[PDB]
Amino acid sequence: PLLAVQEALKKCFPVVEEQQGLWQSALRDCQPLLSSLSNLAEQLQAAQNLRFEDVPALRAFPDLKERLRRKQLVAGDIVLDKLGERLAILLKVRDMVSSHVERVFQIYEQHADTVGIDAVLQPSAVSPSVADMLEWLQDIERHYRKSYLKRKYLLSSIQWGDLANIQALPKAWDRISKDEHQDLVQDILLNVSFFL
Amino acid sequence: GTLTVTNLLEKVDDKIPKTFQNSLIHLGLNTMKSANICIGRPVLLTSLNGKQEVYTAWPMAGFPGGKVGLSEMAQKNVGVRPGDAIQVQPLVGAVLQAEEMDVALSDKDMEINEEELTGCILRKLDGKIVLPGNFLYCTFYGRPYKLQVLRVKGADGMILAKCNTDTFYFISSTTRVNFT
Amino acid sequence: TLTVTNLLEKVDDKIPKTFQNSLIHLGLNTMKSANICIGRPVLLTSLNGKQEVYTAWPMAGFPGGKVGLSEMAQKNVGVRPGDAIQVQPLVGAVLQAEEMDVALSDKDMEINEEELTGCILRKLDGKIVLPGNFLYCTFYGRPYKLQVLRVKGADGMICNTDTFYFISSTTRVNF
Amino acid sequence: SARKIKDNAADWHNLILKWETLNDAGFTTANNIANLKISLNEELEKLCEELQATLDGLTKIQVKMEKLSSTTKGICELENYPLFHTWPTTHFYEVSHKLLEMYRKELLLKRTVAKELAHTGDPDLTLSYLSMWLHQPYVESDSRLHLESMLLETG
Numbered sequence A: 001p002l003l004a005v006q007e008a009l010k011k012c013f014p015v016v017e018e019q020q021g022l023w024q025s026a027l028r029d030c031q032p033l034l035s036s037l038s039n040l041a042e043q044l045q046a047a048q049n050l051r052f053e054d055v056p057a058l059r060a061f062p063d064l065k066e067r068l069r070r071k072q073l074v075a076g077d078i079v080l081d082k083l084g085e086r087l088a089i090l091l092k093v094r095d096m097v098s099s100h101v102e103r104v105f106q107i108y109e110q111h112a113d114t115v116g117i118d119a120v121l122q123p124s125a126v127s128p129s130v131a132d133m134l135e136w137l138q139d140i141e142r143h144y145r146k147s148y149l150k151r152k153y154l155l156s157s158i159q160w161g162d163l164a165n166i167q168a169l170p171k172a173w174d175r176i177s178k179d180e181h182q183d184l185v186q187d188i189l190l191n192v193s194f195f196l
Numbered sequence B: 001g002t003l004t005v006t007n008l009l010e011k012v013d014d015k016i017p018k019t020f021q022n023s024l025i026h027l028g029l030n031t032m033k034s035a036n037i038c039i040g041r042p043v044l045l046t047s048l049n050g051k052q053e054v055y056t057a058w059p060m061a062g063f064p065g066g067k068v069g070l071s072e073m074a075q076k077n078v079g080v081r082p083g084d085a086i087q088v089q090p091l092v093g094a095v096l097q098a099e100e101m102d103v104a105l106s107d108k109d110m111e112i113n114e115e116e117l118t119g120c121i122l123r124k125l126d127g128k129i130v131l132p133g134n135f136l137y138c139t140f141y142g143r144p145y146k147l148q149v150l151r152v153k154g155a156d157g158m159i160l161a162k163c164n165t166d167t168f169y170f171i172s173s174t175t176r177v178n179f180t
Numbered sequence C: 001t002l003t004v005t006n007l008l009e010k011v012d013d014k015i016p017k018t019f020q021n022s023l024i025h026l027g028l029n030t031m032k033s034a035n036i037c038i039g040r041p042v043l044l045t046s047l048n049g050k051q052e053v054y055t056a057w058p059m060a061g062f063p064g065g066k067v068g069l070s071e072m073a074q075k076n077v078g079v080r081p082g083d084a085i086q087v088q089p090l091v092g093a094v095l096q097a098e099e100m101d102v103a104l105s106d107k108d109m110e111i112n113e114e115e116l117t118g119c120i121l122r123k124l125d126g127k128i129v130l131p132g133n134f135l136y137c138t139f140y141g142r143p144y145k146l147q148v149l150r151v152k153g154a155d156g157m158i159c160n161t162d163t164f165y166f167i168s169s170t171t172r173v174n175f
Numbered sequence D: 001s002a003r004k005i006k007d008n009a010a011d012w013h014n015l016i017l018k019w020e021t022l023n024d025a026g027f028t029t030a031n032n033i034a035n036l037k038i039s040l041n042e043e044l045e046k047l048c049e050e051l052q053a054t055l056d057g058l059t060k061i062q063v064k065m066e067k068l069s070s071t072t073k074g075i076c077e078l079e080n081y082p083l084f085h086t087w088p089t090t091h092f093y094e095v096s097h098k099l100l101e102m103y104r105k106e107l108l109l110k111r112t113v114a115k116e117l118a119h120t121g122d123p124d125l126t127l128s129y130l131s132m133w134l135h136q137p138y139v140e141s142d143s144r145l146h147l148e149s150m151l152l153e154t155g
Helices: A002-046 A066-113 A132-157 A163-177 A185-194 B027-035 B070-079 B113-123 C017-021 C071-076 C112-122 D002-038 D042-078 D088-115 D124-136 D142-152
Strands: B001-005 B042-046 B053-059 B085-090 B097-104 B148-153 B175-177 C001-005 C024-026 C043-047 C050-057 C067-069 C085-089 C094-096 C098-101 C136-141 C142-152 C164-166 C171-175
Touching: A002 A066, A002 A163, A002 A185, A002 D124, A066 A132, A066 C112, A066 D124, A132 A163, A132 A185, A185 D088, B042 B070, B042 C085, B085 C017, B113 B175, B175 D124, C001 C071, C017 C085, C071 C085, C112 C136, C112 C171, D002 D042, D002 D088, D002 D124, D042 D088, D088 D142
Parallel strands: B097 B175, C001 C067, C024 C050, C094 C164, C098 C171
Antiparallel strands: B001 B085, B042 B053, B042 B085, B097 B148, C001 C085, C024 C067, C043 C050, C043 C085, C098 C142, C136 C142
8 A cells, every 4th residue: 555655765765865975975086086187188288389399498309299298198088087987987876766766656656546645645743745755756866867967968078179178177067066956865865864 | 732932952963954944943753743743844833922923843853842942033033932832833724935025124224235135035045934024034144134024925916814724925036025 | 729718807007007908818827838928919810810919918816728808809809708719929020000091980970080090099009900900999988999901011011920010109090 | 147137127116116206306396486486586596406406316316227227238148158937038128228218318308397497488388397397208108017017027
């Protein structure tokens, strides 16, 4: 009966908690790498505003521009592959939580013929509602998916050859996070704590 | 249906909703069960002087029965003291969004940048259901304020609320405020 | 002439990723049997007739008398775990390939030849290659496989005792 | 004989390590100089002096590894009239010679960036110079690999 849906929710939530923690640590690692990458791109942007044959000392040298550029790009490539790894971990958490939420909804739609909608709307003393809990699960899956898919189409528009965009990256990245409801995961967790 | 007002025993590091942070009438679990309370739902407060104000109940553990520890500012705006009696009711009526709310300043007349204070009040007081003639508190950069609301108008159509089963209103990010 | 397993999982933090890719793994006796020499390019051949070069390396705790190979190795040669191979310590003269023909993956969704050749040249510093073989690059994660058509040696010079050629910043790329 | 070669290997390792460490310290110094310059005397002077001292430590390292190279070449020649794991032992000299050439040209570039860092104009030169100091743009990465490989054949 309805106890099945209740058990489903009690099962689904702690997963959401731990996954949120993982997401958080991932993005936390992600930040300073991207800072360093901005710095690298700037330093490179500088080193093509010269002629490297119209400065006296450097002149007594066969070729610097080429070798230095090659080294700079190797460093950049390494740091960007680190970012790629982080993005992979993000993808993992998205897919996992989406599968779980879908399982919950499917259980409900399986049973929602003997549990009158009215019984879905009994806010007890220590439990908001099965209704609002399903709603919040739905909203949390949407939040995760949109955040992930908006972070990718930012991180994969990096091309050595647009050295303004890279140098601007960190601000755009940080901004991608200051437009959701951080309270989403935080308050959902709190708000449903007493349910356990 | 009747409880003993105390002062909030505040130590809430992880005090949950980084929102309810303003309404916050704490309670006790069994007290919730007695008065049909339920988390996150509003609740009506009636004083022995005929003043009223509502608040989002919250069952923070670590409290004894009958001690519905309010906040100091509620204790002022409704005029109670730590030990009196008060009437608690579980709100049942409608709850809509409120478009027009007009309100005048206290004697701190410095003519602050109008829309700026609007921005602060909104970004600080989501969900605080209001009534005619109450007081709000939005510490806009340390500098406190104290506002007296006169009339409010909600999208449904009426314009201002003494009993429980009837209209109310609250402030959302699409509310208009007048300063007169 | 030795049997082929799959490459192990005991990768070293040293020898940065780039070279970590191009490698084959061996054991001590495997080194001291065909008398090959560490860090020196080595030739592999299948019975089908696929010859491919790599950089040999003996890894600690390798199962004696075997040779591990990369997944991309097994692909580019066409051998499965348990199969045999023909290993040869390269003793010819290795030189610097001047210019090299390339065949794309032909799914060219607006490929920037300058950028492509830059990335290729970069991620393939020490790499000898014979025609008809293939290359694997990671143009920002999105992988690419390239096919080699012809090779022009330094001295116009287009068997484990012949000459072979690697890549360098000066080598030109043609399509 | 081969014992000396193994010693040469371990010395290569520790020498390059000390190199990197001193380069780190010098990079900090050069940052200080660039900032102090951009902000607008004798303070700057003491700075340049201790930077030159860093360069001299570098030079000491260079001469030690050059001696390493020479002894290796000597043993190479003396083996005229084969090892742990069957290397040509000429290969050894080839390795050490590539290493030496790399690091020596590197030292020259460091010397020029010191020689110029004090009085520079437009800041973009300054960034490019700090770069030249840090990224060591004359040390092809495989070097470490090379060393490792050689280092591998003698524990």
